Structure formats: structure tokens, C-alpha cells
Amino acid sequence: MNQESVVAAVLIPINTALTVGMMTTRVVSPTGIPAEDIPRLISMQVNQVVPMGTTLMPDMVKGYAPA
């Protein structure tokens, strides 16, 4: 029951295009966006200032959506 969740590998500001070099996978709680959405978050900007280490949420990304 330990699924890797997207984690701001770096200080991700608001309305900031997400990249593969900005996010990361880590077993954080609560478990947010799946590491499988990492490549789905790319090109997508955040709707909030997400600090480095702050789990990425689905309601914390613009134009985002599950798959």
C-alpha cells in the first residue's frame, strides 16, 4: 500500500510549467498524484506555490486530470 506520489523535486511556484526535472517520486503521505502522472504533469502548470518536497495534488495542477 506504498505507492509513489509526485513530489516537488524543487521549489515549484504557482502557475509554473511542470517538468520531469522538477517533479519526483516518493512515498509521501498523504499519497498525492501518482508517479505515473509525472509524465502527465509535464507541460502543466501548478495552481499554487508548491515548495520542494510538497506532494503534488490533482487539485493543485491546472489543466490537469487523471488517466
Backbone angles phi, psi at 33, to 5 degrees: -40, 140
SS3 per residue for 3-61: CCEEECCCCECCCCEECCCCCCEECCCCCCCEHHHHHHHECCEECCCECCCCECCHHHE
First-last CA distance in the chain: 20
- List the domain boundaries for the chain: 1-67
Domain 1-67 has CATH 3.40.630.30: no
Decide: residue 26, CB within 10 A, 0-12 exposed, 13-18 middle, 19+ buried.
Answer: middle
Rounded CA separation 39/58 (Å): 14
Experimental approach taken: NMR
